[PDB]
Amino acid sequence: MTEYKLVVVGAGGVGKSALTIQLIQNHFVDEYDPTIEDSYRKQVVIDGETCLLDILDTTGQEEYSAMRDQYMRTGEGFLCVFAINNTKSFEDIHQYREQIKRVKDSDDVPMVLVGNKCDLAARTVESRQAQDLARSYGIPYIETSAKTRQGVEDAFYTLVREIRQH
Ligand SMILES: Nc1nc2c(ncn2[C@@H]2O[C@H](COP(=O)(O)OP(=O)(O)NP(=O)(O)O)[C@@H](O)[C@H]2O)c(=O)[nH]1
Numbered sequence: 001m002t003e004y005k006l007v008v009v010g011a012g013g014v015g016k017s018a019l020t021i022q023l024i025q026n027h028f029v030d031e032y033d034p035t036i037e038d039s040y041r042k043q044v045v046i047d048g049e050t051c052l053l054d055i056l057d058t059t060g061q062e063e064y065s066a067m068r069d070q071y072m073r074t075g076e077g078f079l080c081v082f083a084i085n086n087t088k089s090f091e092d093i094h095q096y097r098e099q100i101k102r103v104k105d106s107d108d109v110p111m112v113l114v115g116n117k118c119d120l121a122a123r124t125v126e127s128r129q130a131q132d133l134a135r136s137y138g139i140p141y142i143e144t145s146a147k148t149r150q151g152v153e154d155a156f157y158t159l160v161r162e163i164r165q166h
């Protein structure tokens with residue numbers, strides 16, 4: 001069947017795993033559990049199409065920046081995740097976007113900019129400036145909460161549709 005190779009990238013602790021685990025396992029992991037590299041394959045139906053989501057849940061640890069190239073080449077679509085209460089993770093987005101572009105020899109890679117943790121009231125990244133960023137990349141901006149599940153399916157399914165339109 002059609003498979004979509006999705007990759008979730010971003011600074012440590014933004015909720016990359018929490019987002020993936022909500023989507024695949026319908027619950028919120030509220031605990032400390034840094035990722036090395038986890039893969040999730042799940043058969044779903046999206047807009048009537050039987051397909052396989054092949055999701056790579058990556059690490060934010062900057063020491064492994066050199067090992068990102070290999071999985072970025074293979075990924076068809078990318079969630080670039082920051083947390084709306086972590087300004088540094090939003091500044092870090094640019095470095096992820098640029099490495100993906102460099103490694104993919106592409107400046108129109110399927111990609112969604114994801115503002116996660118939108119359940120938290122203590123926001124430090126205004127939605128408008130994240131939206132301004134996504135507009136300058138030419139990609140959708142979606143806010144999510146892995147805790148409440150708000151926007152989660154939206155972010156992943158939009159990414160799949162970005163791949164279908166590429
Ligand atoms: N309130 C709230 N907390 C969240 C949300 N997503 C993740 N968290 C919490 O934030 C922490 C980090 O989440 P995690 O998913 O492990 O982050 P990560 O980006 O995978 N980290 P790593 O890069 O090390 O693998 C955890 O305590 C998690 O429960 C969210 O949407 N809302």
Ligand SMILES: [Mg+2]
Nearest residue numbers: 016017034035
């Ligand atoms: Mg993780």
